[PDB]
Enzyme design. Structure first.
Site, PDB file in Angstrom:
ATOM      1  N   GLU A   1      38.108  34.104 -32.814  1.00 53.59           N
ATOM      2  CA  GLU A   1      36.973  33.464 -32.365  1.00 53.59           C
ATOM      3  C   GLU A   1      36.003  33.203 -33.307  1.00 53.59           C
ATOM      4  O   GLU A   1      35.367  34.060 -34.154  1.00 53.59           O
ATOM      5  CB  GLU A   1      36.455  34.196 -31.150  1.00 53.59           C
ATOM      6  CG  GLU A   1      35.127  33.281 -30.598  1.00 53.59           C
ATOM      7  CD  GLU A   1      35.041  33.667 -29.008  1.00 53.59           C
ATOM      8  OE1 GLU A   1      36.049  33.614 -28.280  1.00 53.59           O
ATOM      9  OE2 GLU A   1      34.085  33.259 -28.525  1.00 53.59           O
TER      10      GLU A   1
ATOM     11  N   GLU B   1      37.735  29.434 -28.749  1.00 50.41           N
ATOM     12  CA  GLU B   1      36.373  28.884 -29.396  1.00 50.41           C
ATOM     13  C   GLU B   1      36.073  29.141 -30.827  1.00 50.41           C
ATOM     14  O   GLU B   1      35.507  30.010 -31.342  1.00 50.41           O
ATOM     15  CB  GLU B   1      35.086  29.532 -28.525  1.00 50.41           C
ATOM     16  CG  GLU B   1      34.870  29.020 -27.171  1.00 50.41           C
ATOM     17  CD  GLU B   1      34.143  29.788 -26.303  1.00 50.41           C
ATOM     18  OE1 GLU B   1      34.146  31.112 -26.437  1.00 50.41           O
ATOM     19  OE2 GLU B   1      33.405  29.489 -25.522  1.00 50.41           O
TER      20      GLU B   1
ATOM     21  N   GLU C   1      40.298  28.970 -18.818  1.00 53.05           N
ATOM     22  CA  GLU C   1      39.083  29.478 -17.965  1.00 53.05           C
ATOM     23  C   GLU C   1      38.499  28.634 -17.064  1.00 53.05           C
ATOM     24  O   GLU C   1      38.349  27.451 -17.379  1.00 53.05           O
ATOM     25  CB  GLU C   1      37.961  29.824 -19.180  1.00 53.05           C
ATOM     26  CG  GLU C   1      38.114  30.827 -20.241  1.00 53.05           C
ATOM     27  CD  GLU C   1      37.197  31.187 -21.042  1.00 53.05           C
ATOM     28  OE1 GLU C   1      37.551  31.677 -22.334  1.00 53.05           O
ATOM     29  OE2 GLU C   1      35.991  30.597 -20.970  1.00 53.05           O
ATOM     30  N   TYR C   2      38.044  29.186 -15.833  1.00 54.29           N
ATOM     31  CA  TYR C   2      37.390  28.463 -14.788  1.00 54.29           C
ATOM     32  C   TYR C   2      36.707  29.518 -13.695  1.00 54.29           C
ATOM     33  O   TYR C   2      37.014  30.547 -13.751  1.00 54.29           O
ATOM     34  CB  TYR C   2      38.546  27.822 -14.075  1.00 54.29           C
ATOM     35  CG  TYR C   2      39.378  28.273 -12.839  1.00 54.29           C
ATOM     36  CD1 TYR C   2      38.903  27.520 -11.583  1.00 54.29           C
ATOM     37  CD2 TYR C   2      40.201  28.917 -13.153  1.00 54.29           C
ATOM     38  CE1 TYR C   2      39.788  28.222 -10.616  1.00 54.29           C
ATOM     39  CE2 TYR C   2      40.850  29.419 -12.138  1.00 54.29           C
ATOM     40  CZ  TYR C   2      40.733  29.100 -10.811  1.00 54.29           C
ATOM     41  OH  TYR C   2      41.367  29.509  -9.528  1.00 54.29           O
ATOM     42  N   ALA C   3      35.899  28.781 -12.925  1.00 52.90           N
ATOM     43  CA  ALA C   3      35.033  29.409 -11.879  1.00 52.90           C
ATOM     44  C   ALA C   3      34.464  30.637 -12.160  1.00 52.90           C
ATOM     45  O   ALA C   3      34.405  31.610 -11.849  1.00 52.90           O
ATOM     46  CB  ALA C   3      36.353  30.000 -10.851  1.00 52.90           C
ATOM     47  N   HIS C   4      33.675  30.231 -13.376  1.00 54.80           N
ATOM     48  CA  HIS C   4      32.722  31.480 -13.835  1.00 54.80           C
ATOM     49  C   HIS C   4      32.094  32.337 -12.629  1.00 54.80           C
ATOM     50  O   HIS C   4      30.919  31.945 -12.120  1.00 54.80           O
ATOM     51  CB  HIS C   4      31.654  30.753 -14.974  1.00 54.80           C
ATOM     52  CG  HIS C   4      31.025  31.632 -15.676  1.00 54.80           C
ATOM     53  ND1 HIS C   4      29.913  32.215 -15.461  1.00 54.80           N
ATOM     54  CD2 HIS C   4      31.484  32.306 -16.997  1.00 54.80           C
ATOM     55  CE1 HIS C   4      29.496  32.959 -16.741  1.00 54.80           C
ATOM     56  NE2 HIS C   4      30.516  33.197 -17.678  1.00 54.80           N
TER      57      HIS C   4
ATOM     58  N   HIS D   1      33.106  31.085 -32.745  1.00 50.45           N
ATOM     59  CA  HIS D   1      32.204  30.339 -31.882  1.00 50.45           C
ATOM     60  C   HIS D   1      30.707  29.979 -32.623  1.00 50.45           C
ATOM     61  O   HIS D   1      30.406  28.608 -32.536  1.00 50.45           O
ATOM     62  CB  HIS D   1      31.990  31.154 -30.687  1.00 50.45           C
ATOM     63  CG  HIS D   1      31.527  30.299 -29.435  1.00 50.45           C
ATOM     64  ND1 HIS D   1      31.421  30.947 -27.999  1.00 50.45           N
ATOM     65  CD2 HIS D   1      31.279  29.047 -29.436  1.00 50.45           C
ATOM     66  CE1 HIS D   1      30.845  29.821 -27.470  1.00 50.45           C
ATOM     67  NE2 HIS D   1      30.738  28.765 -28.008  1.00 50.45           N
TER      68      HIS D   1
ATOM     69  N   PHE E   1      24.609  37.732 -19.174  1.00 48.63           N
ATOM     70  CA  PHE E   1      25.798  36.989 -19.369  1.00 48.63           C
ATOM     71  C   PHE E   1      27.044  37.721 -19.676  1.00 48.63           C
ATOM     72  O   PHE E   1      28.055  37.124 -19.886  1.00 48.63           O
ATOM     73  CB  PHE E   1      25.548  35.799 -20.178  1.00 48.63           C
ATOM     74  CG  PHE E   1      25.037  34.599 -19.878  1.00 48.63           C
ATOM     75  CD1 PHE E   1      23.677  34.118 -20.026  1.00 48.63           C
ATOM     76  CD2 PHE E   1      25.877  33.774 -19.087  1.00 48.63           C
ATOM     77  CE1 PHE E   1      23.061  33.112 -19.311  1.00 48.63           C
ATOM     78  CE2 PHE E   1      25.232  32.473 -18.468  1.00 48.63           C
ATOM     79  CZ  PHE E   1      23.887  32.205 -18.580  1.00 48.63           C
TER      80      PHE E   1
ATOM     81  N   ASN F   1      19.869  38.878 -27.923  1.00 51.19           N
ATOM     82  CA  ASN F   1      20.729  39.277 -26.891  1.00 51.19           C
ATOM     83  C   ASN F   1      20.795  38.312 -25.852  1.00 51.19           C
ATOM     84  O   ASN F   1      19.943  37.417 -25.695  1.00 51.19           O
ATOM     85  CB  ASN F   1      20.256  40.506 -26.115  1.00 51.19           C
ATOM     86  CG  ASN F   1      18.992  40.557 -25.709  1.00 51.19           C
ATOM     87  OD1 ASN F   1      18.889  39.982 -24.454  1.00 51.19           O
ATOM     88  ND2 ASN F   1      17.780  41.107 -26.435  1.00 51.19           N
TER      89      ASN F   1
END
Ligand SMILES: [Mg+2]
Ligand code: NA
Ligand code: NA
Lengths: 210, 211
Positions: B24, B69, B145-148, B26, B209, B205
């Site tokens: 990753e 990412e 990835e879906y529906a956070h 990102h 999340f 930070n």
């Protein structure tokens, strides 16, 4: 004196079962056509392009009937309004097609056209093609003609393109119908139909179903 | 890659696993600044190949993923082909650079919406129902990835599953995510409380999340 025995029902009707009033008779124009003995018997206009529609080749295939003579020619000339933009003259005798040769009674003309004005429903530009059959020495036998519109229709990568671009068909199905006249069509009504169609944001029409 | 036991557990209980290289990048500007730099290809290859050299025999692993990412850069293309060459028994996927790159056998968006288009430039998130039928597109669509599910969430979940069942090439997805990344701290009276971003005086930070 003519005698026309029109039948309402025929083996034709099995393939004519459209959802519409069933009527019959001589319902479109009747006409008489005098052609020369040496005549234009068919013609096909084709227009192909380069990648950005700035160059086009018009390709007209002409067919004749009558006795073949060396003095025979077809000229094809393309007009935009009253300017002649391109023109081609050749004798009859098409390219070699197979082991027996070619079409003695066909000739294909290729006219180059720089920066053609493209045809669309948005801007319906029209050039005019004139197909003259004549003796080389300059005697017209007959001329036939059509309106030409430079446009390209293809399906590439799953879209329907016209002159390169993806169409959005705002269309209507239109039957040929009149309340008094039935299925007999006239100019006044066809035009009335078109202006309203275009007035209410349509750009396409299906000949449902004939 | 996960603790070795985990795959054996999926092998035996019954779960399809997407095995993911540890890559990753990102925070990079741009996100592919590394993955496109061929001076970073060696370190990347070892992160894909050594995964493949470990878990290739686990039946539960059915899909190789090149990472997460990290934009899209040539290195991904080379390492996509490497697995395709080494192990034909599994499809390779990757969400980077727009979720439908030449680096993926599966269109795998993250948080693509069911009906609503999000046309971000270079990397748009099309509605999954629309994405499938884009000109010249043939691959399946399983969101990586879906529906956070962050706090009081998973609103509109229904909408995905109805679409999934209706569209054959919509083959579902992976919810983000399974378990809250909160951590146990203790108050002045030794009573345990769940903490998140910032609570260790760690700065900067991203607060709650992590849950
Ligand atoms: Mg019917
Ligand atoms: Na489905
Ligand atoms: Na998070």
């Amino acid at each position: 004196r003519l005698a026309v025995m029109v039948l309402r029902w025929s083996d034709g009707s099995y393939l004519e079962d459209q959802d519409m009033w069933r009527m019959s008779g001589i319902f479109r124009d009747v006409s008489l056509l005098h052609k020369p003995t040496t005549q234009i018997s068919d013609f096909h206009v084709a227009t192909r392009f380069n990648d950005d529609f700035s160059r086009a080749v018009l390709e007209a295939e002409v067919q004749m009937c009558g006795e073949l003579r060396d003095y025979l020619r077809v000229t094809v000339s393309l007009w935009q309004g009253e300017t002649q933009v391109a023109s081609g003259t050749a004798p009859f005798g098409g390219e070699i097609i197979d082991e027996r040769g070619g079409y003695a009674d066909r000739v294909t003309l290729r006219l180059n056209v720089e920066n053609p004005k493209l045809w669309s429903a948005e801007i319906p530009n029209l050039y005019r093609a004139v197909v003259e059959l004549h003796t080389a020495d300059g005697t017209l036998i007959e001329a036939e003609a059509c309106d030409v519109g430079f446009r390209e229709v293809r399906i590439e990568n799953g879209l329907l393109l016209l002159n390169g671009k993806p169409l959005l068909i705002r269309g209507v199905n239109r039957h040929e119908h009149h309340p008094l006249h039935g299925q007999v069509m006239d100019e006044q009504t066809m035009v009335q139909d078109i202006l309203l169609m275009k007035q209410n944001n349509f750009n396409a029409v299906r000949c449902s179903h004939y | 890659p996960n603790h070795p036991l985990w795959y054996t557990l999926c092998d035996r209980y019954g779960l399809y696993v997407v095995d993911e290289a540890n890559i990753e990048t990102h925070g990079m500007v741009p996100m592919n600044r590394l993955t496109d730099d061929p001076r970073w290809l060696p370190a990347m290859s070892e992160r894909v190949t050594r995964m493949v050299q470990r878990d290739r025999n686990h039946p539960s692993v059915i899909i190789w993923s090149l990472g997460d990412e990290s934009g899209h850069g040539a290195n991904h293309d080379a390492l996509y082909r490497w697995i395709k060459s080494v192990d034909p028994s599994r499809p390779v996927q990757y969400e980077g650079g727009g979720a439908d790159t030449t680096a993926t056998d599966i269109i795998c968006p993250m948080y693509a919406r069911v009906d609503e288009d999000q046309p971000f430039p270079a990397v748009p998130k099309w509605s999954i129902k629309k994405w499938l039928s884009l000109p010249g597109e043939t691959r399946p669509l399983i969101l990586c990835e879906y529906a956070h599910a962050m706090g009081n969430s998973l609103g509109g979940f229904a909408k995905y599953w109805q679409a999934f069942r209706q569209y054959p090439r919509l083959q579902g997805g992976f919810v983000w995510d399974w378990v809250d990344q909160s951590l146990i701290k203790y108050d002045e009276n030794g009573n345990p409380w769940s903490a998140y971003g910032g609570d260790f005086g760690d700065t900067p930070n991203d607060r709650q999340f992590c849950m």
